[PDB]
Design an enzyme around this catalytic site. Sequence first.
Site, short mmCIF file in Angstrom:
data_model
loop_
_atom_site.label_atom_id
_atom_site.label_comp_id
_atom_site.label_asym_id
_atom_site.label_seq_id
_atom_site.Cartn_x
_atom_site.Cartn_y
_atom_site.Cartn_z
N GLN B 172 0.81 -1.22 0.00
CA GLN B 172 0.00 0.00 0.00
C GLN B 172 0.85 1.27 0.00
O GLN B 172 0.70 2.14 -0.86
CB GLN B 172 -0.94 0.03 1.21
CG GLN B 172 -1.76 1.31 1.29
CD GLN B 172 -2.99 1.17 2.15
OE1 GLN B 172 -3.94 1.92 1.99
NE2 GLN B 172 -2.97 0.22 3.08
N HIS B 176 1.52 3.92 -3.30
CA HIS B 176 0.92 5.24 -3.17
C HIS B 176 1.77 6.41 -3.59
O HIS B 176 1.37 7.56 -3.40
CB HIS B 176 0.41 5.46 -1.74
CG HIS B 176 -0.99 4.99 -1.53
ND1 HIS B 176 -1.32 3.65 -1.48
CD2 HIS B 176 -2.16 5.66 -1.46
CE1 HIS B 176 -2.63 3.52 -1.38
NE2 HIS B 176 -3.16 4.73 -1.37
N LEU B 353 -5.66 -2.41 -11.85
CA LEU B 353 -5.09 -3.72 -11.55
C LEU B 353 -4.40 -3.86 -10.19
O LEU B 353 -4.34 -4.95 -9.63
CB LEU B 353 -4.09 -4.08 -12.66
CG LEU B 353 -3.01 -5.15 -12.54
CD1 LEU B 353 -2.27 -5.14 -13.85
CD2 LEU B 353 -2.02 -4.87 -11.41
N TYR B 354 -3.88 -2.75 -9.67
CA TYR B 354 -3.18 -2.78 -8.40
C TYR B 354 -4.08 -2.62 -7.19
O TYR B 354 -3.60 -2.40 -6.09
CB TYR B 354 -2.09 -1.69 -8.38
CG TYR B 354 -0.78 -2.15 -7.79
CD1 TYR B 354 0.43 -1.74 -8.35
CD2 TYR B 354 -0.73 -2.99 -6.69
CE1 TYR B 354 1.65 -2.18 -7.82
CE2 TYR B 354 0.48 -3.42 -6.16
CZ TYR B 354 1.66 -3.01 -6.73
OH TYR B 354 2.85 -3.41 -6.17
N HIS B 357 -7.13 -4.77 -2.55
CA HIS B 357 -7.71 -4.55 -1.23
C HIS B 357 -8.01 -5.81 -0.41
O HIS B 357 -8.01 -5.76 0.83
CB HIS B 357 -8.94 -3.64 -1.34
CG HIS B 357 -8.59 -2.20 -1.59
ND1 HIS B 357 -8.25 -1.69 -2.82
CD2 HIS B 357 -8.46 -1.17 -0.72
CE1 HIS B 357 -7.91 -0.40 -2.66
NE2 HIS B 357 -8.01 -0.01 -1.40
N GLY B 495 0.26 -7.43 -15.03
CA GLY B 495 0.97 -6.63 -14.05
C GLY B 495 2.48 -6.47 -14.20
O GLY B 495 2.99 -5.36 -14.12
N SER B 499 4.85 -3.31 -14.24
CA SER B 499 5.72 -3.35 -13.08
C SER B 499 7.21 -3.18 -13.34
O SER B 499 7.83 -2.27 -12.82
CB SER B 499 5.48 -4.65 -12.30
OG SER B 499 5.52 -4.44 -10.90
C1 COH Z 1 -2.69 -2.63 -2.84
C2 COH Z 1 -2.82 -1.31 -2.28
C3 COH Z 1 -3.86 -0.83 -1.39
C4 COH Z 1 -4.22 -1.23 -0.11
C5 COH Z 1 -3.62 -2.41 0.74
C6 COH Z 1 -5.34 -0.37 0.26
C7 COH Z 1 -5.98 -0.44 1.48
C8 COH Z 1 -7.05 0.31 1.94
C9 COH Z 1 -7.67 0.17 3.27
C10 COH Z 1 -7.28 -0.78 4.34
C11 COH Z 1 -6.84 -0.40 5.60
C12 COH Z 1 -8.68 1.08 3.32
C13 COH Z 1 -9.64 1.36 4.46
C14 COH Z 1 -8.66 1.76 2.01
C15 COH Z 1 -9.52 2.76 1.65
C16 COH Z 1 -9.52 3.41 0.48
N1 COH Z 1 -8.65 3.15 -0.53
CO1 COH Z 1 -7.16 1.84 -0.67
N2 COH Z 1 -5.65 0.50 -0.76
C17 COH Z 1 -4.75 0.22 -1.72
C18 COH Z 1 -4.72 0.89 -2.91
C19 COH Z 1 -5.61 1.93 -3.27
C20 COH Z 1 -5.58 2.70 -4.63
C21 COH Z 1 -4.56 2.40 -5.72
C22 COH Z 1 -6.63 3.57 -4.53
C23 COH Z 1 -7.22 4.53 -5.61
C24 COH Z 1 -6.80 5.99 -5.49
C25 COH Z 1 -5.38 6.26 -5.83
O1 COH Z 1 -4.52 6.20 -4.91
O2 COH Z 1 -5.13 6.54 -7.00
C26 COH Z 1 -7.24 3.39 -3.22
C27 COH Z 1 -8.32 4.11 -2.78
C28 COH Z 1 -9.00 4.06 -1.56
C29 COH Z 1 -10.18 4.93 -1.15
C30 COH Z 1 -10.91 6.10 -1.95
C31 COH Z 1 -12.10 5.67 -2.85
C32 COH Z 1 -11.73 4.70 -3.99
O3 COH Z 1 -10.87 5.07 -4.86
O4 COH Z 1 -12.31 3.59 -4.06
C33 COH Z 1 -10.53 4.53 0.17
C34 COH Z 1 -11.64 5.06 1.09
N3 COH Z 1 -6.59 2.36 -2.45
N4 COH Z 1 -7.65 1.30 1.15
C1 LIG Z 2 5.96 2.04 -11.74
C2 LIG Z 2 6.48 1.86 -10.29
C3 LIG Z 2 6.80 0.40 -9.90
C4 LIG Z 2 5.51 -0.42 -9.84
C5 LIG Z 2 5.74 -1.92 -9.66
C6 LIG Z 2 6.21 -2.46 -8.37
C7 LIG Z 2 5.57 -3.53 -7.80
C8 LIG Z 2 4.36 -4.18 -8.44
C9 LIG Z 2 3.85 -5.51 -7.88
C10 LIG Z 2 3.32 -6.47 -8.71
C11 LIG Z 2 3.24 -6.24 -10.20
C12 LIG Z 2 2.22 -7.04 -10.99
C13 LIG Z 2 2.32 -8.42 -11.11
C14 LIG Z 2 3.46 -9.18 -10.44
C15 LIG Z 2 3.40 -10.68 -10.42
C16 LIG Z 2 4.54 -11.44 -10.51
C17 LIG Z 2 5.86 -10.82 -10.62
C18 LIG Z 2 6.94 -11.48 -11.43
C19 LIG Z 2 6.60 -11.44 -12.91
C20 LIG Z 2 7.80 -11.71 -13.79
O1 LIG Z 2 8.85 -11.03 -13.61
O2 LIG Z 2 7.70 -12.60 -14.66
#
Ligand code: COH
Ligand SMILES: CCCCC/C=C\C/C=C\C/C=C\C/C=C\CCCC(=O)O
Lengths: 553, 553
Positions: B172, B176, B353-354, B357, B495, B499
């Site tokens: 996360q 970000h 794709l990322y 949640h 991804g 990535s």
């Molecule tokens: C894999 C990454 C990850 C994690 C673990 C995570 C974990 C959590 C989490 C757990 C404690 C909570 C309560 C939230 C809550 C939110 N997240 Co994320 N988020 C994550 C990646 C994102 C992304 C990417 C966005 C979209 C906005 C952006 O940053 O561009 C996001 C957006 C949000 C939003 C704004 C509305 C929306 O775009 O849907 C809320 C509220 N969240 N997130």
């Molecule tokens: C642009 C900033 C950097 C963003 C990327 C950093 C981390 C991204 C995490 C996962 C990316 C999406 C899929 C990964 C799954 C397997 C990885 C090995 C694939 C390979 O090698 O065959």
Amino acid sequence: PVNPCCYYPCQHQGICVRFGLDRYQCDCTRTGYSGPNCTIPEIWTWLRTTLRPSPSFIHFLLTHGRWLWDFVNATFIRDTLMRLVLTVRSNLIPSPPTYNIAHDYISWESFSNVSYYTRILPSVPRDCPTPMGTKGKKQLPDAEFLSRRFLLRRKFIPDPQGTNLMFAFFAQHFTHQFFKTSGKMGPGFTKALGHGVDLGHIYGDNLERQYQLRLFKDGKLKYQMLNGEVYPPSVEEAPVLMHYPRGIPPQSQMAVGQEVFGLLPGLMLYATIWLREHNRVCDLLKAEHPTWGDEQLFQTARLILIGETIKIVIEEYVQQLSGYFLQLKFDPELLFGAQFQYRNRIAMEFNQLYHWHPLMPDSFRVGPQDYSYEQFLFNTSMLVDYGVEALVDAFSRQPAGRIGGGRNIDHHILHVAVDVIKESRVLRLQPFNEYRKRFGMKPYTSFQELTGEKEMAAELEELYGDIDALEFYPGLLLEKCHPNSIFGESMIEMGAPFSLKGLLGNPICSPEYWKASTFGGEVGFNLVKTATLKKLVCLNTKTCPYVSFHVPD
Amino acid sequence: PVNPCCYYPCQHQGICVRFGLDRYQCDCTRTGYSGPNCTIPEIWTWLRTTLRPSPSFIHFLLTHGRWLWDFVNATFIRDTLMRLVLTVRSNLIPSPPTYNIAHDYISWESFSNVSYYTRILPSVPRDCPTPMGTKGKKQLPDAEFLSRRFLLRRKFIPDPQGTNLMFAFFAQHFTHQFFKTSGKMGPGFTKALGHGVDLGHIYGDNLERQYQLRLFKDGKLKYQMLNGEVYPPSVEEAPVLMHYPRGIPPQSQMAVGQEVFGLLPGLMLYATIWLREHNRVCDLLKAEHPTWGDEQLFQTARLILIGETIKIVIEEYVQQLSGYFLQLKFDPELLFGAQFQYRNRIAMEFNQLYHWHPLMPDSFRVGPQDYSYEQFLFNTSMLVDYGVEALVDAFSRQPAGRIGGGRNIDHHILHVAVDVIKESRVLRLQPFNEYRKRFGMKPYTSFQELTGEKEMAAELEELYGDIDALEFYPGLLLEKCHPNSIFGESMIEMGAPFSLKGLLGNPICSPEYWKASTFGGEVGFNLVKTATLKKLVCLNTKTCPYVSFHVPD
Ligand code: COH
Ligand SMILES: CCCCC/C=C\C/C=C\C/C=C\C/C=C\CCCC(=O)O
Ligand SMILES: *[C@@H]1O[C@H](CO)[C@@H](O[C@@H]2O[C@H](CO)[C@@H](O[C@@H]3O[C@H](CO[C@@H]4O[C@H](CO)[C@@H](O)[C@H](O[C@H]5O[C@H](CO)[C@@H](O)[C@H](O)[C@@H]5O)[C@@H]4O)[C@@H](O)[C@H](O)[C@@H]3O)[C@H](O)[C@H]2NC(C)=O)[C@H](O)[C@H]1NC(C)=O
Ligand SMILES: *[C@@H]1O[C@H](CO)[C@@H](O[C@@H]2O[C@H](CO)[C@@H](O[C@@H]3O[C@H](CO[C@@H]4O[C@H](CO)[C@@H](O)[C@H](O[C@H]5O[C@H](CO)[C@@H](O)[C@H](O)[C@@H]5O)[C@@H]4O)[C@@H](O)[C@H](O)[C@@H]3O)[C@H](O)[C@H]2NC(C)=O)[C@H](O)[C@H]1NC(C)=O
Ligand code: COH
Ligand SMILES: *[C@@H]1O[C@H](CO)[C@@H](O[C@@H]2O[C@H](CO)[C@@H](O)[C@H](O)[C@H]2NC(C)=O)[C@H](O)[C@H]1NC(C)=O
Ligand SMILES: *[C@@H]1O[C@H](CO)[C@@H](O[C@@H]2O[C@H](CO)[C@@H](O)[C@H](O)[C@H]2NC(C)=O)[C@H](O)[C@H]1NC(C)=O
Ligand SMILES: *[C@@H]1O[C@H](CO)[C@@H](O[C@H]2O[C@H](CO)[C@@H](O)[C@H](O)[C@H]2NC(C)=O)[C@H](O)[C@H]1NC(C)=O
Ligand SMILES: *[C@@H]1O[C@H](CO)[C@@H](O[C@H]2O[C@H](CO)[C@@H](O)[C@H](O)[C@H]2NC(C)=O)[C@H](O)[C@H]1NC(C)=O
Ligand SMILES: CCCCC/C=C\C/C=C\C/C=C\C/C=C\CCCC(=O)O
Ligand SMILES: CCCCCCCCO[C@@H]1O[C@H](CO)[C@@H](O)[C@H](O)[C@H]1O
Ligand SMILES: CCCCCCCCO[C@@H]1O[C@H](CO)[C@@H](O)[C@H](O)[C@H]1O
Ligand SMILES: CCCCCCCCO[C@@H]1O[C@H](CO)[C@@H](O)[C@H](O)[C@H]1O
Ligand SMILES: CCCCCCCCO[C@@H]1O[C@H](CO)[C@@H](O)[C@H](O)[C@H]1O
Ligand SMILES: CCCCCCCCO[C@@H]1O[C@H](CO)[C@@H](O)[C@H](O)[C@H]1O
Ligand SMILES: CCCCCCCCO[C@@H]1O[C@H](CO)[C@@H](O)[C@H](O)[C@H]1O
Ligand SMILES: CCCCCCCCO[C@@H]1O[C@H](CO)[C@@H](O)[C@H](O)[C@H]1O
Ligand SMILES: CCCCCCCCO[C@@H]1O[C@H](CO)[C@@H](O)[C@H](O)[C@H]1O
């Protein structure tokens, strides 16, 4: 303790780094050399350096075999040379970019803050004995003196290569899209972000200004008929920041895209020409793509001009300049197999070096009439009075002036040159010689060796006290010209790298973009692949006058 | 007349262009194919396509020969594979970038306006019959329903790969820095310019904010001792825009660089860790370079973290994720001989794709205690209460959740997913299948084929009416996971390209920058060349707890 990097110990592009209170280390990485200061040629570097002809020599071959060249010209041997030319030359400008006025070391700031112009060599440490580092006097020659004494034109020396004013202006206009030093931010910063040929001097350099200029219909640009001929619009419809003198901000007070382009008919002339072209492209595109919107029509036509420009600049502008018999060619595909970064960032030394103010004449002949600087500068009707056709013919006919040699900058503008030497010092650019090495040359051993004569030379030694202390701008303009050339060795060897790196580094030239669908249609691509100064004009005028980057006869 | 490009006639990355009122042409340029819609394999393409194993198969080899791999691992055969891996994968993301929410065609605007996120495939024409183009119903499934019905977690399904929360958060926090959608500008725009690993979530994303965070002394970052341990500073010294809830804007109201990083201990935790690292680098650098200023110390240490991060992300983050036996490696030099553009620009599909949640648990166990979302979210003392050592150990021990499979997103956050499906539609992303092709796969022929089961599957067909109409985000999360994998095929194949293109496309990885003098000294380079999650923590804490991206046991 004197900052060792003040001696410039590292050779061959080796990075000088301070370690501890008094020592330093050279990071000869990938310089081809190894050692305390990178002076031990790797096996291959040794071969290369013992087999590479002097630049002096190559310029010779490129300007003599008027038989071997006509042959080479009509064969693949051309593409081969062209591909060679690009690569080797372009492989001299670091990219991603390196340092800037703020950092004499790599930094995320430097990479990303597009505002900063970038430099090739670090700067003279703010703590070195002399102003240039080690040699020279505790004081640099008074730029005002050094100017009138060596850069001020007495008798007008024309350019042996036959260069003309139609070129002189194109040169000014064109270069003004990457060189836009922000007064507010000072020297070393630039308004013209984008660093390149994005025509951000036609369409402006910010979305607003662009929009303010865009006629949001058929992807065209705003304009006004005067005498029945098309010209740019005035702030009274094109409400955008300009620079015309306080007198008649309404009519004949045209908006263009390059804030200062009203101060000279030349610029405004070309400005009229490109705008009149863009809209022309649109007409074509629109017929080819009815189902197209405005944004597209606009953007597509723009790219078609970034193409046309990059082409004319190379196959005609750089041609005339060079004096080569090799027929330069623009084919983005020639680099498709190399390791080339499509990304540029204007340098300050490139800026400095491009101050070819001596191209400017004594007066401006436009037929029987013969305007002066007073009549010309800021004039504001010559353009619509005379007419594109007629004014192009007038410039294409009057010769420009030799850039190098020394003493050939008209007095009127002689002030520009003084500021450059002033600015150069603020920037703390390393000595001419240091830049000579950096661009693959040998440092001059004397002013006598620098200048083809002995008079000027002796006087300079007397001033700088040491050839090594000599400055960047003065050296370039005080260097002996190649025989019958517009300017000397250092101008090409230092200019071409910055030049082609920026010409071919334009995104439109990458494999990804160089498709026929990026110019929407095959019609677009061909417009980019067959552009010409002649066409740029004669396709946007009632009649075809005489036009070229070199006087006839 | 129905916009033909609504059928997506062109195949293999061939650009679809409208010609005239009702026709279209495919610009198969460099796609390896020729023909009306690019379906006639050139001689070599034909070979390649008849000899290339299915991705399904390769994932097999990469996850089985636990003997052949240990060997391959201890030989150059590693570098060979790694170099292969990068290139092939990275050669899928257009660069220079292509389209954006505003333009479904190349444009100078698109290239330069860093604000726009960029897309791989054009968008669904605003005039196509169905919302996805041709197939499907005049209306897409109600995202709220489609969510609770398929994406809402009932029973917590942990991740078979053993992934843990210490990873969940790092994930996360890390992501970000490139994903910062600007609410003001809406979907498809981003605050996080820079598009990559510039740590603009530590040092902020504007000079000011950075400065406001910079302690302008020894190139360090501002901080405060609490319990005798170092933590980020509060707005009361680090006067910078944050997002803590209206309650105690003074203390325990810390400034970090990523506006929203106070809303969860996880983020703030890591935030503490990196800041505490940066300052650590400085101490080292400063001892190695007394004669150095503040700016340097700062910038150099930054890059050393952009290195450390890019390394840990690859040799550990992507490792755990993959499940490979091949031991991924970070060596910028492996691409030194390829044709690679050091330049990235985050894509919207990459963003979509990322959205992993479902990695989030049910509750948060921190020893005997077991906080809930109420106790956790916005909590504002857990960090300083518990302590880095202890909180890392707590996360590194609790498992995360399976990303794919379907139905595994806790309810609390289930809202995020709904917006994604909402946003995806605003953006008008093409159908899952279209994206499957684009990333070198075969379009699914049925939902039954998509999902490993039959229940979910049938219900979806009933909704979307046609597999082809299925959406990007739902497909990825509803796709069958590779056996024992954290997620399915489409996640890796779609991804990895985004990535690694972004990981190795970072300027610090280019030949120009990857020198020991860019991290000032050999000490810098080695810090970048031997980084580790374990070191990132245990070198900035009193004691070494248990830490890894996978639970022990
Ligand atoms: C894999 C990454 C990850 C994690 C673990 C995570 C974990 C959590 C989490 C757990 C404690 C909570 C309560 C939230 C809550 C939110 N997240 Co994320 N988020 C994550 C990646 C994102 C992304 C990417 C966005 C979209 C906005 C952006 O940053 O561009 C996001 C957006 C949000 C939003 C704004 C509305 C929306 O775009 O849907 C809320 C509220 N969240 N997130
Ligand atoms: C642009 C900033 C950097 C963003 C990327 C950093 C981390 C991204 C995490 C996962 C990316 C999406 C899929 C990964 C799954 C397997 C990885 C090995 C694939 C390979 O090698 O065959
Ligand atoms: C590209 O790079 C150029 C710089 O090379 C950028 O332009 C420069 O940007 C900086 C910062 O935006 C600007 O700063 C100058 O420095 C003044 C000093 O500020 C004071 O001293 C420190 C520094 O932060 C603070 O501790 C002081 O306390 C303040 O703390 C409060 C916190 O809320 C403040 O609200 C309060 O005012 C208090 O004083 C104080 O800030 C600064 O005050 C002043 O603004 C000044 O401009 C440079 O002057 C800029 N100009 C140039 C050309 O150098 C450019 O932005 C970069 N481009 C991009 C887009 O990134
Ligand atoms: C990256 O790209 C995004 C856009 O995708 C940029 O942000 C957007 O920027 C535009 C322009 O800056 C902004 O414009 C909106 O459009 C409104 C319409 O404006 C009116 O209609 C036309 C358009 O120019 C004019 O003929 C009108 O007449 C005006 O003429 C006078 C001339 O002096 C004006 O002074 C007078 O007001 C008069 O009305 C009129 O302008 C515009 O008015 C309004 O500002 C509105 O914002 C978008 O809204 C921006 N926002 C977004 C996110 O879309 C972004 O700047 C780009 N990034 C960079 C740095 O380049
Ligand atoms: C080869 C290009 C070229 C030409 C032909 C040219 C022709 C002329 C000309 C003849 C009619 C006049 C009266 C001027 C006058 C000026 N030029 Co130029 N300039 C040119 C390239 C430049 C550059 C480059 C600058 C520096 C500022 C910038 O644009 O970054 C410049 C700056 C200036 C300045 C500001 C002060 C300074 O930087 O020294 C004045 C005044 N001028 N210029
Ligand atoms: C701007 O240029 C015009 C030319 O269009 C100048 O007017 C000319 O002036 C000369 C003598 O200086 C006359 O012999 C020409 O016949 C004039 N042409 C016309 C039609 O005006 C004008 O003087 C210039 N303005 C300034 C500021 O000097
Ligand atoms: C924020 O986290 C703290 C932990 O630091 C919470 O306090 C704990 O609450 C549990 C029961 O909820 C107690 O058994 C622990 O002993 C408490 N620890 C301490 C020292 O406070 C606190 O309740 C949380 N705040 C919010 C908003 O819920
Ligand atoms: C490496 O560069 C330094 C700096 O120019 C050279 O100069 C140092 O050593 C010289 C050899 O005796 C002395 O003449 C100078 O006193 C001394 N100057 C400095 C700045 O330290 C040094 O010779 C170079 N070494 C090589 C391999 O040529
Ligand atoms: C090229 O793409 C078009 C669009 O998918 C294909 O479809 C067209 O031609 C088909 C052949 O008879 C018809 O089934 C469709 O009516 C027609 N649709 C459109 C959008 O024009 C076309 O077959 C493809 N050609 C090839 C070489 O396969
Ligand atoms: C970055 C934007 C584009 C800037 C460059 C465009 C025009 C620059 C004009 C001259 C450049 C400097 C020296 C040219 C001299 C001879 C050219 C041929 C050299 C070669 O090929 O051997
Ligand atoms: C991948 C190989 C591409 C072709 C290699 C051609 C080698 C030319 O090597 C030499 O480089 C010199 C640069 O200093 C030029 O001045 C010479 O004319 C050129 O012959
Ligand atoms: C007959 C022409 C053969 C090829 C000529 C190449 C023209 C460039 O020439 C060479 O370019 C190199 C790259 O900057 C420089 O190192 C050399 O100093 C320069 O002479
Ligand atoms: C293949 C070899 C063809 C003949 C090469 C002759 C090289 C002549 O030599 C050249 O002469 C010029 C003026 O005469 C000088 O300015 C140059 O420095 C020098 O290299
Ligand atoms: C294809 C490029 C080969 C290297 C450059 C060769 C430059 C030749 O140069 C010229 O060739 C003429 C041939 O008639 C001679 O008469 C000239 O004296 C010679 O300088
Ligand atoms: C310059 C040559 C570099 C090495 C070429 C290795 C060729 C490998 O070609 C194949 O590409 C496929 C991509 O679809 C992979 O899945 C296969 O495993 C790989 O063997
Ligand atoms: C044993 C491992 C051999 C090399 C494995 C390469 C891993 C990437 O795998 C391949 O990458 C290509 C590039 O995106 C894709 O076209 C293929 O679909 C994918 O399977
Ligand atoms: C060098 C050849 C080594 C043996 C290759 C065996 C390939 C087995 O095949 C693989 O089986 C997996 C599950 O069993 C499936 O999920 C894959 O789709 C399939 O490719
Ligand atoms: C160096 C990469 C070669 C291609 C990938 C080979 C993958 C091998 O994969 C595995 O190898 C084992 C060998 O003991 C077999 O027992 C397994 O069944 C087989 O699937």
